[PDB]
C-alpha cells in the first residue's frame, strides 16, 4: 500500500533555481526562465525511467527571496516587493526582454504576489493532443532522434513589477514541483549507468556487479 | 556477520556422458519474490 | 503430433504442444467505431497482410553476441505490406512471431528472445547523434558486440548493455521466451499494437525491437555442425490504414 | 517458359549433431492427389 | 513434470512419475496406547526429526564393488535426530530413503538398492571376533571388496557373499530396487520399524542396513565423465522415545 | 510399454504403440459353406500352423541392396506347415508378418517393407527362360543387384526396377511399410489369401513375395556396430486343405 504507484511518485521536489535583478547592464540577468522537461531534474528522473508511458496533472509552488546590493546606497525605506509569474502553454508567445508586448497577453496565465504572503500556486491540467506522455520515443522528430513534439509542456517566466527607473534589487525563485493523479504503462529494466546528458540515453559500458572472493564464498556467521 | 540463511550445492555423483558431447556444462538461476512481500519507509535510493 | 497451419498462400508447420505467450495479455484488435467518429475513415486490406512472411536465417556459432530487428522496416520490402507503407500515411497493426531452430541432440546452448516496446539505443560515443543506418539496415539482421565499441555514428552495442544502458539479466520484465536445446527448439510471441496515439507513420517511429541473445554459449564436438540456423517468421495481424477517398 | 507456382527450400540454420554421429543428412518428397480431381479427353499416351 | 517436496527448512524435487516400494505392505506408525499402558510413558518430538538428511554423494567409478550404511549410527551426528538418540535411552523410527544419481544418455550401468533387515556380518578369518569399527564409519559409505578379504578384525567383503555368507543374486527377497541408467536413475523405500520387542537401544543394535551394489559395471566413451555421483537422502517417520518425567 | 503374444508354445514380445496394416482391408477368413458344396471336401488343421516361425536374421550393412522370400517354398521345411504342404494337394493360408530390427540412436537408415502379390520376375538375358533356383532358395533370402546382372539363368535383379520392369518409387500400391530408425523399427502386415480360384497347389504357384528395399543406406560412426539385424517373424493364419475321406 506504500508501493502504490500514488504513494512512490505523488512528492514535491525543487527543479530550478534562478536570480533575477530589478535593474542590470545585461538584459538577460532581468529575468527568470525555465524551460518544462521531465528529463532535466535527476531526482524525479529514474523513478520515472521504470515505466514507458505517463498521464498526470502538476502542481507548481514558488519560493522568492530578496536582498539589496551591497554597493552603494543605504537608508531606503521600500514598500514590498511584486512579483509576476507567467506560465505559457505549447503554442504562445515568448518574450525577449522585462519590457515586452508578450507580458500582457490575454492567453498567458499569470500570477501576482507580494512579499510577505504565503507561497504562490498554481495548477496545471494533462496538456497534450496526444493521450499520454512519452518517456522513450525510438524514432525521429520528423530530424532529431528520440524526441517528438507530444511531449511539449511550456515554459515558466519570473520578473519584478515595478514602475520607471527602479532600485537595484536582486531575487531568487526555488520552482516547487508535484505529479497529481498519475498512471503508469509498460514497466521497462532501471538504469544500470550514469546519465551523461538531459536528451539522449548515452552512457559508458559499467559492470553489472560487484566482485567477491570465489564463487563458494560465504561470509562468517556472527 | 551475515545472520542470513545460505544455499550451496554439492556434487552427489558427477556428470556421465556418452561420446561425441561437449565436455563442460552450465547451471542458470533466477530470483523473484513470493505473493506476501511487504516494503515501508520510502527513502532514496543509493546507486545515482 | 504436427499442426500446419495455412495463411494466404503460405504453409509452415509447428508442433502442437508448443507454448504461446500473448504479450500483456491482449490480443490485437481493430480501434473500434467511435474514437475520431466524424472524418476519420480507416479501412484494412486483410488481403496480403495476413500472410507468413519467412526472413533469412541466421547462423549460429560458439562466438555469436546476437541479432535484432526493427519492427516495422524489416517488412519494408515483404510484398503488399511494403507497399501499403508507401502509400498510406498512417497505419497499425499486430504482429505473431514464429522463432524455430534446427539442432541436433549433441548440442548444447541457450536463447532468450524478447520484444522490447520503444528500444531507445544510445550512441557509442557520448556527444553524439545515431544515425539512421546504424539503428537498422531492413531484412539484414544487427550484431551486437561482445566488447565495447568505437568510431563514430556507431550503436554502442556491447551485449551486457543491450545498447539500452540496463542490465541485460532483467530484460525478462519485457514479453520474452527461453530457448533451452535440451528441450524445445520453438518460441512464438503475439505482440498487439502499443503505442501512445492509436495510428502513426510507419517510418519516421519503430513501434519496438525483437531481439535474440545466446545466454550459454553454442558448444559441440568432434564431427558436429559447427552452427545452427535459427529461423523467424511474422505473420501481420489485424492491420489498417487511413481511408483515401 | 513455366507459368506455374514453384517450392524451394532454405537453411534457416543449419543442422547440430552430437559426437558419434555420421555426418551427412537426407530428405525425402512424396506425392499424391487430393480429393477433388478431374480428367478429360481420354487420348494415347507418350510413353510407349 | 517435476515434483517438490518440503519437509521443515528442507526442501528437494523429484520426478512425480518415479514409483515407491512400501517395503512389506506396511506403513510407518506409532504404537498405539496400551501394549505398557501403566508406567512406561513414550513421546516424541517431531520437530526436527522430519526433515532431509542428505549425506554425501559417491563416486560411482569402472572398478567399484559398492557401498554401505548402518541405520541408524549414520544419523548419529545428524543434528537433533543424533541429539535424541543421547538424551533417551530407548527408541524407534520409519524412514524413507530417496537414491538418485546424475548420468547422460552416452553412460550405461545397472545398480541395486537393498534395505538388508538385520545384516548380521561375518568375520574375515574364521575363528575370531568382529570389531566394531569394521562394522561402521558413520555417515561414511563402507567398502565391499572384489576379491577374497584378510588380515584381522576384518570384514569378509566379496561382494559375491556380501558378507553374509549368501549369494548375491538372492537379495531380491528384501525390500529392493533396480536402477538401469537407460531408464530412471532414482529409488525410493519406505522402511518401518521391525524388531522383536517395541522399543530398543539406537548404539547397541543395528536395525537394517543399505546396500547399493553394481551388476553392470560402469562403462563410458572418449570423453564423457569418468564417474556418476550418487546420492542418498534420509527423511526419519514417526520416531518415538521414552518419557522423561 | 510392452505386449507379449503366445500362439501354441510360441512367444514373441512387441510395442503395443504399434500400427497395424491390413493389406486390403480384408481380414483372414474361411470360404464359407457352400461354393463347391457336394463332394469338394475341406478341412483345417488349426494346431500347429497358429504359431509363430522364426526365419534367421539378415546383415544390413552400408551396401546391401535388400532381400526377398516367396511365400510359400519359405515355410516349407517350417515343422507341421511344411508337412500339411507335401499330404495335401490343395490349400490355402492368410498370414501375418511381424519384421523388427534392432538400432542404437546413433544408426541412420530407411526401409521399405512391401508384399507383391504375383510378383512375375524377368529373366537377366532377353531371349530366355527363368530357372526356378534363381527364383527362391526356400528360408535364405536372395538378394538384389545395385548394377545390371548378366549370364544366363540369372534374375535382371537390379534395385531399381525390382526385378519387374517397374520403377522401384511406385511400389507404394502394394500393402507396404516404411521403417525409419529415427522413430520406430517395428512393422506388421496382415495378408489374406488373394487369388483368383478359391484353393490352389502349393508348389507351383507362388502367392505373393515379401520384399525388403533401403532406400536412404545405413550409416553410422567412430566405435559403432557396423551392422544391423533384421528379424522376420511369421504366422499363418486360417489355413485349410482338402479332405482326405
Keep these: ?222 | 556477520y551475515t545472520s542470513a540463511g545460505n544455499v550451496t550445492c554439492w556434487y552427489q555423483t558427477g556428470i556421465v556422458v556418452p561420446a561425441g558431447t561437449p565436455t563442460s556444462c552450465s547451471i542458470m538461476c533466477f530470483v523473484s519474490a513470493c505473493n506476501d512481500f511487504s516494503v515501508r519507509l520510502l527513502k532514496d535510493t543509493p546507486f545515482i | 503430433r504436427v499442426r500446419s497451419i495455412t495463411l494466404g498462400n503460405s504453409t509452415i508447420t509447428t508442433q502442437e504442444s508448443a507454448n504461446v505467450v500473448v504479450a500483456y495479455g491482449r490480443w490485437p484488435e481493430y480501434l473500434k467505431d467511435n474514437e475520431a467518429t466524424a472524418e476519420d475513415q480507416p479501412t484494412q486490406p486483410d488481403v496480403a497482410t495476413c500472410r507468413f512472411y519467412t526472413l533469412e536465417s541466421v547462423t549460429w556459432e560458439r562466438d555469436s553476441p546476437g541479432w535484432w530487428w526493427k519492427f516495422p522496416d524489416a517488412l519494408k520490402d515483404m510484398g503488399l505490406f511494403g507497399q501499403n507503407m508507401y502509400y498510406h500515411y498512417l497505419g497499425r497493426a499486430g504482429y505473431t512471431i514464429h522463432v524455430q531452430c534446427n539442432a541436433s541432440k549433441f548440442h548444447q546452448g541457450c536463447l532468450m528472445v524478447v520484444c522490447v516496446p520503444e528500444a531507445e539505443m544510445g550512441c557509442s560515443q557520448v556527444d553524439g547523434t545515431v544515425n539512421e543506418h546504424s539503428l537498422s539496415e531492413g531484412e539484414t539482421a544487427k550484431k551486437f558486440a561482445s566488447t565495447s565499441t568505437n568510431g563514430t555514428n556507431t550503436v554502442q552495442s556491447i551485449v551486457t548493455n543491450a545498447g539500452m544502458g540496463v542490465g541485460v539479466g532483467n530484460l525478462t520484465i519485457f514479453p520474452h521466451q527461453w530457448i533451452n536445446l535440451r528441450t524445445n527448439n520453438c518460441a512464438t510471441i503475439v505482440m498487439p499494437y502499443i503505442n501512445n496515439v492509436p495510428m502513426d507513420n510507419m517510418f519516421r517511429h519503430h513501434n519496438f525491437t525483437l531481439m535474440i541473445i545466446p545466454f550459454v554459449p553454442l558448444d559441440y564436438s568432434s564431427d558436429s555442425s559447427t552452427y545452427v540456423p535459427i529461423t523467424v517468421t511474422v505473420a501481420p495481424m489485424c492491420a489498417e490504414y487511413n481511408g483515401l477517398r
Design chain 1, 1 to 222: 500500500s506504500e508501493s502504490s504507484i500514488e504513494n512512490f511518485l505523488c512528492r514535491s521536489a525543487c527543479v530550478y533555481m534562478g536570480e533575477y535583478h530589478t535593474t542590470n547592464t545585461d538584459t538577460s540577468k532581468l529575468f527568470a526562465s525555465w524551460t518544462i522537461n521531465a528529463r532535466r531534474m535527476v531526482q524525479m528522473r529514474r523513478k520515472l525511467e521504470l515505466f514507458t508511458y505517463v498521464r498526470f496533472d502538476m502542481e507548481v509552488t514558488f519560493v522568492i527571496t530578496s536582498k539589496q546590493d551591497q554597493g552603494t546606497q543605504l537608508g531606503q525605506d521600500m514598500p514590498p516587493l511584486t512579483h509576476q509569474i507567467m506560465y505559457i502553454p505549447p503554442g504562445g508567445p515568448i518574450p525577449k526582454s522585462v519590457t515586452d508586448y508578450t507580458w500582457q497577453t490575454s492567453t498567458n496565465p499569470s500570477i501576482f504576489w507580494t512579499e510577505g504572503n504565503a507561497p504562490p500556486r498554481m495548477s496545471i491540467p494533462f496538456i497534450s493532443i496526444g493521450n499520454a506522455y512519452s518517456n522513450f520515443y525510438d524514432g525521429w522528430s520528423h530530424g532529431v532522434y528520440g524526441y517528438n513534439t507530444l511531449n511539449h509542456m511550456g515554459q515558466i517566466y519570473v520578473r519584478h513589477v515595478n514602475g520607471s527607473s527602479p532600485l537595484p534589487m536582486t531575487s531568487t525563485v526555488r520552482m516547487y514541483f508535484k505529479p497529481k493523479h498519475v498512471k503508469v504503462w509498460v514497466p521497462r529494466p532501471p538504469r544500470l549507468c550514469q546519465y551523461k546528458n538531459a536528451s539522449t540515453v548515452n552512457f559508458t559500458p559499467t559492470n553489472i556487479t560487484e566482485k567477491r572472493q570465489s564463487i563458494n564464498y560465504i561470509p562468517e556467521t556472527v
